[PDB]
């Protein structure tokens, strides 16, 4: 499944992220890439010899805007640095 | 005269700023230090 948050397991390299088609050119002996943080950045599908990027699922802080319970109980929620389409 | 001296004085600020990127070393250091801080912070995740 592409372009969606899935729990993925490739040959035992487990993790959670969004699998997209990549433009990376793996060498024939390289099973998987990495980032500077030693987290997996790209994997080669063992059944379909293609290269997939892995993007961690969207997340962000949650900040509550409260006028003050002494005034109202109605609140407004701020999803920091996240597009409205994923909320 | 004081007018011309101030106007010309303003102009030289442009050139000193336009040519010398190190005129803004202080601010660049602030970003660089923080950039160093985070990168080191990120890299530790690779340590056993």
């Amino acid at each position: 499944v592409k372009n969606k948050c899935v729990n993925f397991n490739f040959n035992g390299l487990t993790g959670t992220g969004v699998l997209t088609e990549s433009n990376k050119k793996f060498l024939p002996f390289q099973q998987f890439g990495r980032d500077i943080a030693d987290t997996t950045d790209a994997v080669r599908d063992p059944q379909t010899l293609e290269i997939l990027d892995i993007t961690p699922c969207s997340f962000g802080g949650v900040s509550v805007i409260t006028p003050g319970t002494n005034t109202s109980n109605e609140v407004a929620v701020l999803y920091q640095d996240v597009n409205c389409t994923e909320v | 005269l004081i007018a011309n001296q101030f106007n010309s004085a303003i102009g030289k600020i442009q050139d000193s700023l336009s040519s010398t990127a190190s005129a803004l070393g202080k601010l660049q250091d602030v970003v660089n230090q923080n950039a160093q801080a985070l990168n080191t912070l990120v890299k530790q995740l690779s340590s056993n």
Binding site: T39, P56, G60, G61, Q80 | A21, L24, Q28, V42
Partner: peptide, 21 residues
């Protein structure tokens, strides 16, 4: 002249144009 692991950056309250005013 100046230039995914839980690490974010919050935006400043005042914006760059805001400062300019």
């Amino acid at each position: 002249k100046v230039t995914f692991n839980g690490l974010t950056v919050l935006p400043p309250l005042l914006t760059d144009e805001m400062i300019a005013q």
